[PDB]
Design a protein around this ligand. Structure first.
Ligand SMILES: CC1(C)C[C@@H](CO)N(c2ncnc3[nH]ccc23)C1
Length: 167
């Protein structure tokens, strides 16, 4: 039993809600919140910019030290950093950016990172400015993640479409 509220169950292990991941994190304070990061951990906009803003830029400061030490992440890769005031941990996951020509097949690799954590609050990956189709991303999530994932979908129209088209 966890403190997530009002989620629609999609499968044995996937739950979905029309919600802002930042507001969900502030309310629930989950063990793990997923960021839809880029390889540079430059948290400018979307999920990343909004999460970072909610940490008063502490996420960016921590991330810049991480990159200075370790270099960029791989597309499809991840790192675990602090969740600051939003969660215990933040799993920064890089999905492919289709507007950069990156391979959509790497979206499955990106979601595989979720399997290292028993429970996560997460956004849809690659489906923002990264240009991928959100229907496909949800299908990949469901077919890849085996741990318990609570998906926060920002756009109401998209949420309705994802639910009504979910197979
Ligand atoms: C609509 C997007 C460009 C795509 C989507 C991630 O696929 N995203 C968000 N999803 C959930 N909570 C969110 N808070 C702030 C942004 C945000 C931004």
């Amino acid at each position: 039993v966890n403190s997530f509220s009002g989620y629609l169950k999609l499968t044995d292990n996937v739950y979905i809600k029309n919600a802002d991941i930042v507001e969900e994190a502030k309310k629930v304070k989950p063990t793990v919140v997923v960021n839809a990061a880029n390889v540079y951990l430059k948290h400018g906009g979307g999920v990343a910019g909004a999460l970072n803003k909610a940490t008063n830029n502490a996420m960016q400061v921590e991330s810049d030290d991480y990159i200075a030490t370790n270099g960029p992440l791989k597309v499809g890769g991840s790192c675990v950093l602090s969740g600051h005031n939003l969660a215990k941990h933040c799993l920064h996951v890089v999905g492919p950016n289709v507007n950069k020509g990156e391979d959509i097949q790497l979206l499955k690799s990106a979601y595989e990172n979720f399997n290292q954590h028993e429970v996560l609050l997460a956004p849809l990956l690659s489906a923002g400015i990264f240009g991928a189709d959100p229907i496909h991303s949800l299908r990949v999530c469901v077919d890849t993640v085996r741990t318990n994932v609570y998906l926060a979908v920002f756009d109401k129209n998209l949420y309705d479409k994802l639910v009504s088209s979910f197979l």
